[PDB]
Amino acid sequence: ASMDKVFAGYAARQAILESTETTNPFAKGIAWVEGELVPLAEARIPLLDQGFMRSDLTYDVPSVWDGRFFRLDDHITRLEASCTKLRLRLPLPRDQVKQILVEMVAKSGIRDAHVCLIVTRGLKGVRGTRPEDIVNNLYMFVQPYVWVMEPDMQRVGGSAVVARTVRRVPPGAIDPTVKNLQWGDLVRGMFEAADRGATYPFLTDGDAHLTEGSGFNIVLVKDGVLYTPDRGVLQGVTRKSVINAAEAFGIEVRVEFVPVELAYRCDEIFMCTTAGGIMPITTLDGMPVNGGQIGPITKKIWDGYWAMHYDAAYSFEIDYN
Amino acid sequence: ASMDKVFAGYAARQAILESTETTNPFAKGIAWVEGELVPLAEARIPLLDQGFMRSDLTYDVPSVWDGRFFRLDDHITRLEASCTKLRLRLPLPRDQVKQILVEMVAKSGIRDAHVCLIVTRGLKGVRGTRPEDIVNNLYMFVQPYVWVMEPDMQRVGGSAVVARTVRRVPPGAIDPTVKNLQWGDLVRGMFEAADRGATYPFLTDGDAHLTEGSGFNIVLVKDGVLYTPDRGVLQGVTRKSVINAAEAFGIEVRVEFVPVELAYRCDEIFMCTTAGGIMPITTLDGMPVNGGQIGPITKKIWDGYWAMHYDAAYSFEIDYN
């Protein structure tokens, strides 16, 4: 049980960061706009950027934990794959982007962070001018680590519903493997969950199978096997990490079509995402999940995920001086 | 045939406007941000606005022609309806908003313009925040009139394809009656049309029926009757004007499910939108539409639409002094 150790470390680092605020203007976050570094709350973008006027963009969000970047290359590679699918190009060389990110994290002093990169079409749409001519825009920022499930809730588990008033945008309309900020269905899902007295929405494909939630992938546990949707979802880096850990532990993972009915007969449920890690679900549609306690396989995955944050194969330490 | 006089009047007013670009800092557009007026190219918004970070917003675009606002009340009413659907509230009273828009157009000096109003959730998302704490943001701007089809192309008609690599987002994922900037499918359709040697994409509902395109509604003409999709599309104010004109002329309009097959067997096709008006389509999937000339019913609708811009029931004159 690593929860106590992981969360006590975070609480201690948070107190040190809070002490810095009156002396460090970047302690609450730092942004890169047009090559200049500014405090996050002061960052501004042009109103006419097509990332605002058509959400014509992609983004990605690696993280820093205890001063160690977690799987940064995997996130940059995914960002480049998303850009390719949208006919965008990352505006700076990949090695230069990584040094800028490390430099931003060091200036902020933040040890537990989310690091967001956004690539937009730019100030003009393609139809007026030839594509090579158009100029894509890049925005980057570092912020204190964000929780889809707060630490004290991970100790108990959260409540979820299978959404009935909304379903996930299908891949032949918007490709969910392209990480994006067009959250119309996901925001509807969050309002529905609150209306029904629960915290998290699980969205279907509108054809009796599960996809993904408002900012996380979904994993079901049944008879010692993990199940998680293949089509219709982001290929999450936390999900990839869950697969690495399960394979090291000898637990089978099936990435395939997951019927909605399995969610009502399984042994454990958890969500996974970079903004929070491994997040247990213990009631679904108001009913306890197999008794309502956090399950043994969820616990083993939770411990294994956080151990990977100190493994040289998945992380590297930032020099803050 | 009013095309000659409508287009020649626009050309004359445009020549006057462009002559003033070095003396009038607002001749290329004016924006309202946090109560301050600025040139449109200088307008900036906070990077953390949820209208950018989640496209959590709705927008509406009323127009000014020849110094006359067209159907402004209808646009404001639609924007209020979209806000109610998204649980957003317009920040200022409607009468105040109309007064600001008139002041901005008068300051700009622009006779022909598109006026854009955007309402966003705000700096913070609802979760973890007081409902009182949440504060919706308002952005407004006036820009020179935008043409989805330029005047010279309207004289001959444009080229369209029925999209095969993308379909429209369905209403149970994102409600298309809520005017929005989540254009992922619409942008895919624009790239597909260009790849196929055409300009305009017509998107299906992914169930063998037509919806709308990348910024316009779709109207088919067959045996003296107009057909236009009911479900899955924005309820356009130009489409409403088309219906008014058809009824005055004794032409039947059916607002209903429109099978994809009718597009290959109809007598005329046109698109309609506030950014351009009535836009004929004379090539579809590389084939002439019924001989390839602009049809007679399209021509009557074209003339009737522009005549409404001088009818006091649908328009009012702006005081530029």
Ligand SMILES: Cc1ncc(COP(=O)(O)O)c(C=O)c1O
């Ligand atoms: C829609 C969606 N699905 C899944 C995820 C989880 O992806 P990752 O583990 O790479 O953060 C996210 C993360 O933000 C997300 O927004």
Ligand SMILES: Cc1ncc(COP(=O)(O)O)c(C=O)c1O
């Ligand atoms: C998606 C979409 N459909 C239809 C329309 C036409 O609506 P209106 O005639 O009200 O401008 C627009 C206009 O911008 C649009 O963006």
